[model samples]
Target chain A: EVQLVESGGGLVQPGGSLRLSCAASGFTFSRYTMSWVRQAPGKGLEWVATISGGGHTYYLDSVKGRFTISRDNSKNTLYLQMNSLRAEDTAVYYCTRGFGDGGYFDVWGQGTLVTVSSAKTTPPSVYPLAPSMVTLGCLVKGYFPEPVTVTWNSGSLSSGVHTFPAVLQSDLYTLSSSVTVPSSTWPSETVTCNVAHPASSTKVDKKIVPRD
Target chain B: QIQLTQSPSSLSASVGDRVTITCSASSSVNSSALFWYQQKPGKAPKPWIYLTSNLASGVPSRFSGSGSGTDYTLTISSLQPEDFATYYCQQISGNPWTFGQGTKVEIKRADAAPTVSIFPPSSEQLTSGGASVVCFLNNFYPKDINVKWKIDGSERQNGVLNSWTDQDSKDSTYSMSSTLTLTKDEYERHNSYTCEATHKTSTSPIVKSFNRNE
Candidate 1:
């Protein structure tokens, strides 16, 4: 088919799950590829993954589990599924089509809104860990309005506590940057930062390593 | 794990006809990001729709859309043979999101898709007097065109090309500017030069070619 227009109204759930779909028409279904993307309340596009009509999918390395995408060839529609629903997931969702190896998002769906009216926070992490090998995991905590990439290297991290707690407030949107290099590469190479903005011409990458 | 599967052709329409595509969400997505693309042979597919129903800048007005809540569609009112390219569906409702398999639209007659017209698909002199070349694609779609220059029928090793588009015309067509620079002498005589455009929905590239200037 030619277009992937979605059907559904804006949704509201305090702590429940969200589901959405994209339907196609106008052309043959087997020749195209479908993908899912997310845009912050105000921002550019970022790829979530690539799904084949034969029932296969691949994801970007910068994201976490808890979200799933699927499709029904018989119905000519694609599906997006998310779990452990929280306020951070509140945003507009859209179905898209991706060109192979293009390194850019080309096609998109009419978006769906999923707003978490309320929610609860999980217990905080307070366990002191044994130091077999401490490799930090750098991530964007809480609501990330833009598409960001994570890099790991051996070296001192930037001056900041673990991003998990700092930006994890359940009500408002917050993003924290962390430095994690597999403890193995300590004081070597370096961690890097990269970002792709809609107005930007290229993906920005930088080297960042902490001073011990 | 995220997956997107799309059925092959489920609808048929003629030139100047309006058509739509359908995609579904297997799970709940709480994000608001979506994109749709159109493709043809020998060229890259350009975006027809982005961020839901909002069309990309300079896209043709004949394209309009609606739908949310897991189901979506894209409609083209007039189907030109030039419009008979491939179409793909995608979503970014959440991180780790995905795409739907594609749909290809073929011509009912012997008409082949319009061949992309291009210029200067070979080497040129750079501002620094160094060796470089510029390539151009005319009357192509912004979301569905790609420009590349190869020297001597072999891919250039370590070269850079620059491209830009002018889609302000009433037809929403495109004008591409591409440049390739070789730090050293990477040119050969009688080499084949190629520029290709594609739509993710199409099976082949809409290619244009030239031979290196003697």
Candidate 2:
């Protein structure tokens, strides 16, 4: 059948790019298949990958390429995008019931939490979504795998910050911008999105409105 | 680091009816911690749960349990039909010890599963002080339901759980919760406290009732 469940808690950072969601009901969402399992905050459990019903996808070699497992199937839902995130990948992201490519998963979901702190890249001219020196952006949230970060509230900057190797080991991944932001103050200046778990942690921030 | 095998390694009852067991693990042990064992047919598999739950000691508190630390559960609060036979569970710290493939309590014909429900379902009676057991299993439909609280089926490794689940339009509804705290002299009488709610490939499970009713 289909009994997936997710969407409870949010925050991201570390290379940045997260979007977790796995809402299912009853059965037929095309039939089944919708994977992604990683539980490491306490340890044990890992599968990561498998999304059918149109956005066909398959991972689980450890998962890579900023991860990406999408599906909507008319709202039955199932998403999970991981991009350029890091911090060992923080975990606690589930959405089971498989058969699209990843084999047996049964039916699970009641897990939600993504923590990956440590992300602050910038080196250009100004800032505000990329438009300073050349180009170096950061603003994630388009899929699943929640675990992101950006950091930069004013600690002292002269021009030097370019990170983007795309690690994302477990919390899924998705990252690669090149590095930009070069100028000064625009709105108020603030960028935060955290998700840490050993026990508990959560955060989310955004304050840069200044585009005249 | 996730391995569980569980099978029909035990079973034999004689109460009202129905009895089944099976827990297989080997990869993807997300929850990790399952312990279940009810000997009489042999004995020597105690410790209902350690990480999968919490409820271990003199036992007999009726017996109850659940699942997650990689599939688990234990139920026997009501099989007073005499409760004859076997039941087992052991995740042993998530490392080398996985069981659940046992089912036997003779005198069959009385297995119920009507929508299934168990949330804060009272079960306190120790007077002089020391007795707090909370068991849950709401609705039903495949959310991989599981819980713990055993004393006649072993494994109660410091029992202490906090499971969850609550939905409305997800295939026949869904609701699961568990909270435990025992100390009525560790659990007396025919000694029991079980709570099983399974769904690995679907087989049958929605137990929680110990104290005659055979």
Candidate 3:
């Protein structure tokens, strides 16, 4: 009958700091331990920090000295403080129940989505997964911040296209979009990977034809 | 050649119901050759009725064994709480021993509906990593659920992963999540990614999707 209420999750800039809260109920505060679990977008769960009833704390090396886990026995609440947030720190943080010599999620918070704004990387590179087979890919790399738009020839051919969201690369950003067309629509087609990035206020269109 | 085949490989029965299990061999065995053993889920098998319709020591009278030659029968007069388990038949008259296919007796179960929701992929791409579409299944029962992913309205067989069901310690209900990861090329190639979940409580498969337009 335990419930974990999470708060203090929102947008933040690079090197920002955040103080997250996980309110507790249905169990004693001082008798239980709490751990902060995080799930990076498209990644697996990671154990970042833990705080026990006796005030002893544990943490993983991934976060280094950037995280602190503590609880308030008087109000039955748990708190997580983070600093020097990196792009990798942009994830949903979960406060889950823990016990001595145990690791299970009997109770957990609702999860908070925290994002750290970030950038650097190259121009759009037109490539092909199989140019010989009519499959083409466009890479939009070396940019900063997000809100990037990737289109295929501006709807000249919107069907059968795939574009990935942002990818963090060395503090920079990248996006990829690809397409496949019929044999009759390749050499004669102007299939392009058009990209727009707010960071550079730049629009790039790349269409590299394969060897005949 | 000697072989033993069991009929009705599986059955569902409740308490107070009577059940009869059948085992037949290709050739006639010794009159005292048939054997029956009871096995509970995750527990070891124990002797029930030994060779030739003879009940093992300490077995209750509710269980009776009969039949001869190539066939044998194990009858439960009335299934008690503990009698709702599986039974296996074996014969040892030839080649030392040969076991027949086992039969399972399961209790007919009730169903609980799940609250289905789909969380669209994150809007802000904070990392140079991929994005994932999540299909969340919450408050389900029986701990059994099947999820399928679809691209552009067609079912997909790859690039999907399912999480183990998490049972609520307080209510005993279950929660599960399925993730679909796609390449940037694959993302722009399709209009949407859908998660279709099948559960006992859902008359129709619960469908949720994340689309480019969204």
Candidate 4:
């Protein structure tokens, strides 16, 4: 029962970096050479990189400079680090095992789809919540891709938090998170929502002030 | 926030021996946030111990759990054949809940075949530094195997390195890799290489080649 399981894939914007893993199990991972192939929508199989059990690795000329193939023998896993991403790089990637003397790919992993989108990161805005001024809401909206990290001040709030699933709209994604703050600290303590997005270098922080 | 370490990946016992597996956290977690499960490898896991040393419904009294601030333990007081399954743990006391690597309680466990293959040298190595071709021996049993390197169809006696064979405790199979280093001129001169692995499971010698061409 040979199994080749791939790491889950998701959205990545141009210029961002991504690392995909192929975990080998039920077989001897180090005894064979493996390959990662990328298929762009209608296009057929395109070889990305290959790694031999003996530690040699090769990359196709097209992705030679920006892509890498590495593995963890102890964990029985192979990794592909895709750097300097572009929209055209979006595709279903497969990790395959090469066998026999001719080096034919006999086992193929379930395809992991990577969507490369040129995304925009919108600044976050704060909204007051009930428990009256005790809880604050931060909305990170109009962003492409599904994941964004939202933090209160520099880290977690005194109380546990909640984050709403990002709702897609107009080809963008929007999300909100809530945090509970002490009533005495309100109006006195400065509250800020820090957001980290794949497309941005520095975190975008939004501060909230009460207005009559 | 959730990371965990489970001790004693596998243990053997008779009918009355006490079997225990413990969880220490993501970095060491909130003790009360612990959860545990049990099952055979072929079946889905079932809840055994809840967050607070509480046993789940249908769980036997022989199973007990206890822990303090950063560590926790799950024990089977009277190990039985019915209990000879895998034990698992999960940490939800913190963000991004994580699971333990799992511990197996087995009657113990066999022979395995090695898969032989390899890749060519990379562009970076081809142009910049050393070009080392490697022969890998994977998932073999008994740890008894042989590997030889042939350069340009001729056997090379020295200037090669073979690794120590290491067994994976999880499945008991072994793996080792050997490397042959070549100079840039020697590689670019288009010299071909061959690797042959002889193991008990292999019908004949596993012959693989990295033939060089423009």
List DockQ, one per candidate, in order. Answer: 0.06, 0.01, 0.01, 0.02
Residue range with the least summed lDDT across 10 consecutive positions in model 2 chain A: A122-131
Model 1: per-residue Cα lDDT over B22-112, one tens digit each? 6556755332355566754323346677543567899998897754466555666666656665576666555454566666654333212
Error of 3 at A188 (Å): 60
For B122-172, candidate 3 gives per-residue lDDT tens digits of 333213345555555665676688998888988886766555432333344
TM-scores of chain B alone in all candidate structures, in the order given:
0.40, 0.20, 0.54, 0.47
lDDT of 2 at A59: 73
Candidate 3 chain B minimal-lDDT segment of 10 residues: B119-128
Residue B45, candidate 4: Cα error in Å is: 15
Steric overlap count per candidate? 128, 104, 17, 3
Put down candidate 3 lDDT per residue, A21-133, tens digits, no spaces: 98998887788777786756644345577776788888767676998888889988889999999888988888877544224344667677677873332344322222333
Candidate 4: true contacts recovered, fraction: 0.00
Writing each residue's lDDT as its tens digit, candidate 4 over A38-117 gives: 76653434557778888888776667789989989999998999999888888878887865420345677876768787
Candidate 2 C-alpha lDDT tens digits along A62-143: 4567788888788888888888877766877878775433344446676777766653222111112322433323322122
**What RMSD value applies to candidate 3?**
21.1
Candidate 1 residue B80 Cα shift, in angstroms, is: 27
Query: What lDDT score goes with residue B114 in model 1?
Result: 28
Q: Judging by DockQ against the true structure, name the best candidate.
A: 1
> At residue A66, what lDDT does model 4 achieve?
92
Worst 10 residues of 1 chain A by lDDT: A123-132
